[PDB]
């Protein structure tokens, strides 16, 4: 647990890349398509990808991204606190 960086000493970008966005959407779409509970008010949609986008819009995806520094340490960022461009 020595690798983990304290929250105050986080020196990575506070925006989320396109790769992280695509990975998160894919994971959430798979979990929804495997009958996982939905955290938002579904309105007439039957596609897991669109419901994943909808959950992302209200920032309700309960996932955490771990970013690997080259030496081996890592930095943990919640999906709620990552700024997503539109």
């Amino acid at each position: 647990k020595e690798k983990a960086i304290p929250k105050d000493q986080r020196a990575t970008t506070p925006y989320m890349t396109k790769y992280e966005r695509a990975r998160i959407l894919g994971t959430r779409a798979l979990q929804i398509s495997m009958n996982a509970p939905v955290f938002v008010d579904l309105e007439g949609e039957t596609d897991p990808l669109r419901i994943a986008m909808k959950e992302l819009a209200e920032k309700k995806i309960p996932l955490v991204i771990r970013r690997y520094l080259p030496d081996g340490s890592f930095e943990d960022w919640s999906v709620e606190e990552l700024i997503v461009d539109l």
């Binding site: 970013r67 690997y68 520094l69 080259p70 930095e75």
Partner: protein, 85 residues
Amino acid sequence: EGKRIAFGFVDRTLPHFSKDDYSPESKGFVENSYLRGLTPQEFFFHAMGGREGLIDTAVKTAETGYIQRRLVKALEDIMVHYDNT
């Protein structure tokens, strides 16, 4: 090859000329047009001009392919990290 039609025979370019001829019409000049029509000699010279580019494509495809493969194999493992390095 960047020059006018050289002397393929000895001291001329085609059996219909005379030795030591340097006039433009004898060294590959086409004063006609595609609408008018080409006379036989300038037709022959145009054919050689086209053959050059045909060869160019047909071989340098392969040479450029080899260079491209070597380049991509050399650099394939370079990535921007989170340190921005």
